[PDB]
Amino acid sequence: SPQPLEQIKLSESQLSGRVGMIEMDLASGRTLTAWRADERFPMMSTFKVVLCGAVLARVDAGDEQLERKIHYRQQDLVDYSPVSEKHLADGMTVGELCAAAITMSDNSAANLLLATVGGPAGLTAFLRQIGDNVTRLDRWETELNEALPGDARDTTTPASMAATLRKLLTSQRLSARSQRQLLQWMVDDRVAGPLIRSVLPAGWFIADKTGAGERGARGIVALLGPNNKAERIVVIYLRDTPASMAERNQQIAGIGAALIEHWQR
Ligand SMILES: OC[C@H]1O[C@H](O[C@H]2[C@H](O)[C@@H](O)[C@H](OCCCCCCC3CCCCC3)O[C@@H]2CO)[C@H](O)[C@@H](O)[C@@H]1O
Ligand SMILES: *C(=O)N1C[C@H](NOS(=O)(=O)O)CC[C@H]1C(N)=O
């Protein structure tokens, strides 16, 4: 491969769309590679990690329990709800809802959880409380994926998302058990985790959440590292490209290949 920044540029040229990326040391927060890291991109389903951060903060404060069963109705459901469509009868716990949202990208689960944290405005307020003044949620599933050109709604920046993920996973804003739970939900992603592992060299750790939206919007938030350790946060967003889902996936994989090849930096 070319160096990471060279590959990122190449990806952007080949996609005819915009790429945004941060590679950040998880322990120290140092930024190692950055490309358009202060530009706005739709979060899409990647927002569900921050959502469940806000849920966990409520559990730590005694204002929520992961065991609390939420009974919901069919009229509540939106598109892509593979897990929540199974539990109309008996409901799902708050914790099961987070697992469904993060590990199966269940959109209705995400909306149920958004209710519990005060909606998009409430999640945004949580973001401001942990010192993220950039990321914003404005809408519910599935309208938050619309990705209208130049629309700041439901966006983050690579730099802000990476910093926020580090805060949630490592800063002790969340309790020890909560940090461990949030990490484990990302380890357990069924949507892209196993696919990523199938192309990773032996010895490389992955935990992740992916997303997709309109106008080619695609993204991943991840923890990655050699020696079976989560060494770095990697955030990649794509927007405004007419490329196929397959070519967007391949281009993200190519950036990952370059990071691996030139890891020592
Ligand atoms: O010398 C480093 C390694 O080089 C190759 O590994 C290849 C691998 O065979 C290929 O499948 C992958 O594709 C990239 C797969 C990327 C998947 C992770 C992508 C995510 C993770 C973080 C968020 C953004 C993207 O590249 C690496 C590096 O060249 C060799 O196969 C391997 O034996 C060797 O250990
Ligand atoms: C999140 O971006 N959404 C939920 C679902 N799966 O996302 S993923 O496969 O990219 O992880 C479908 C895409 C999407 C959506 N449009 O709501």
Residue numbers in the entry: 26 to 238, 240 to 252, 254 to 292
Text taken from the publication that reported this structure:
Bacterial β-lactamase enzymes are a major contributor to antibiotic resistance by hydrolyzing β-lactam antibiotics. Avibactam, which is used in combination with the β-lactam antibiotic ceftazidime, possesses a relatively broad-spectrum inhibition activity as it can inhibit class A, C, and some class D β-lactamases including extended-spectrum β-lactamases such as SHV variants. Furthermore, avibactam inhibits serine β-lactamases via a reversible mechanism which differentiates it from the currently available inhibitors. We found avibactam covalently bonded to S70 in the active site of KPC-2 and SHV-1.
